[PDB]
Scaffold this active site. Structure first.
Site, short mmCIF file in Angstrom:
data_model
loop_
_atom_site.label_atom_id
_atom_site.label_comp_id
_atom_site.label_asym_id
_atom_site.label_seq_id
_atom_site.Cartn_x
_atom_site.Cartn_y
_atom_site.Cartn_z
N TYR B 16 0.82 -1.20 0.00
CA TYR B 16 0.00 0.00 0.00
C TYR B 16 0.86 1.26 0.00
O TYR B 16 0.59 2.20 -0.75
CB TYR B 16 -0.96 -0.02 1.19
CG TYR B 16 -1.67 1.30 1.39
CD1 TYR B 16 -2.84 1.60 0.70
CD2 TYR B 16 -1.14 2.25 2.25
CE1 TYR B 16 -3.47 2.82 0.88
CE2 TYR B 16 -1.76 3.46 2.42
CZ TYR B 16 -2.91 3.74 1.75
OH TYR B 16 -3.49 4.97 1.94
N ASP B 40 -9.59 9.32 7.69
CA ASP B 40 -8.30 9.93 7.41
C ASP B 40 -8.47 11.44 7.32
O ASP B 40 -8.99 11.94 6.32
CB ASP B 40 -7.72 9.34 6.12
CG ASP B 40 -6.34 9.89 5.76
OD1 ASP B 40 -5.90 10.92 6.30
OD2 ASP B 40 -5.70 9.27 4.89
N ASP B 100 4.08 12.94 9.50
CA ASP B 100 4.21 11.61 10.09
C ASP B 100 2.83 11.01 10.35
O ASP B 100 1.97 11.67 10.94
CB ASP B 100 5.04 11.68 11.37
CG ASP B 100 6.45 12.17 11.12
OD1 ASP B 100 7.14 11.57 10.26
OD2 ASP B 100 6.86 13.16 11.74
N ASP B 103 -0.95 4.29 9.89
CA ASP B 103 -2.16 3.70 9.33
C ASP B 103 -2.48 2.41 10.07
O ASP B 103 -1.59 1.57 10.25
CB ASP B 103 -2.01 3.40 7.84
CG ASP B 103 -2.29 4.59 6.97
OD1 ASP B 103 -2.52 5.70 7.48
OD2 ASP B 103 -2.27 4.39 5.74
C1 Q6J Z 1 -3.38 14.99 1.72
C2 Q6J Z 1 -1.94 14.79 2.21
C3 Q6J Z 1 -1.15 13.89 1.27
C4 Q6J Z 1 -1.57 12.42 1.40
C5 Q6J Z 1 -1.60 11.86 2.84
C6 Q6J Z 1 -2.37 12.80 3.79
C7 Q6J Z 1 -2.21 12.31 5.22
C8 Q6J Z 1 -2.72 10.89 5.39
C9 Q6J Z 1 -2.11 9.91 4.39
C10 Q6J Z 1 -2.80 8.55 4.57
C11 Q6J Z 1 -2.45 7.51 3.53
O1 Q6J Z 1 -2.45 6.34 3.79
C12 Q6J Z 1 -2.16 8.03 2.14
C13 Q6J Z 1 -1.47 9.39 2.08
C14 Q6J Z 1 -2.18 10.43 2.95
C15 Q6J Z 1 -1.83 14.21 3.63
C16 Q6J Z 1 -2.38 15.33 4.53
C17 Q6J Z 1 -1.93 16.62 3.82
C18 Q6J Z 1 -1.32 16.17 2.47
O2 Q6J Z 1 -1.56 17.06 1.40
#
Ligand code: Q6J
Lengths: 128, 128
Positions: B16, B40, B100, B103
């Site tokens: 993943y 999330d 950081d 999951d």
């Molecule tokens: C949207 C984001 C990029 C992708 C991230 C996410 C944070 C949670 C993780 C959970 C996953 O398992 C996948 C990636 C995702 C970020 C918060 C701010 C940033 O822009």
């Protein structure tokens, strides 16, 4: 304390690891809500309440031989929950061993641990 | 695949992260079961529906310049669940940033993601 903020979760969960590391079972149990549940390892039947949680930590930490330290930052939520990676150093088959664990915790509105789930299995146990 | 063993959970959760890091949204969404839920960050209402999960990942990864890497081993249970620490790298407020995350995932008896919980908040955001 109220329902812990994200920063307060980070502090509480770090303190919990410090209490594990020193082996202060009484102080660990006092961090738990009186009717808390523990699942450790996750997948095993839940343990309910401070009496049963104390007995559990007594078997696990009471024998001595256990150190623990964070191996990354505490991840915290805005709803009083968090997750943390750490490594437990103990003895397996008469030699040092390391166990990698993630604890997930939910705190209540009094800042006590309502639920804890400890993710690990034998795939996370390493030796020299 | 049936309910993933602890070892299969380690592989699926690492896979993943590999897919997130490359940014293949369709490959990521195929990992999810039909009735999967995504929380999330944890603390937000669950997202449900395959199309809503695809839109979620498109909003987050659509730009192509997000990276993701494990920052410790996958912790795997024997009931098809696990938890893993990782770090995301991205651009925000005109700054290169890191986030950081941990999951927590539950897999079904087909090896597809049933529940995904991403623990993180702004306390886990840093400027690189
Ligand atoms: C949207 C984001 C990029 C992708 C991230 C996410 C944070 C949670 C993780 C959970 C996953 O398992 C996948 C990636 C995702 C970020 C918060 C701010 C940033 O822009």
């Amino acid at each position: 304390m109220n329902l812990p903020t994200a920063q307060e979760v980070q502090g509480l969960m770090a303190r919990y690891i410090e209490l594990v590391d020193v082996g202060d079972i009484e102080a660990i149990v006092q961090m738990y809500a009186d009717d808390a549940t523990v699942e450790d390892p996750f997948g095993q039947p839940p343990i309910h309440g401070r009496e049963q949680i104390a007995a559990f930590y007594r078997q696990g930490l009471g024998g001595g031989k256990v150190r623990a330290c964070l191996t990354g930052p505490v991840r915290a939520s805005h709803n009083g929950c968090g997750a943390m990676p750490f490594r437990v150093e103990m003895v397996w088959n008469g030699q040092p061993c390391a166990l990698d664990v993630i604890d997930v915790m939910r705190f209540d509105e009094h800042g006590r641990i309502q639920t804890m789930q400890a993710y690990w299995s034998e795939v996370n146990l390493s030796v020299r």
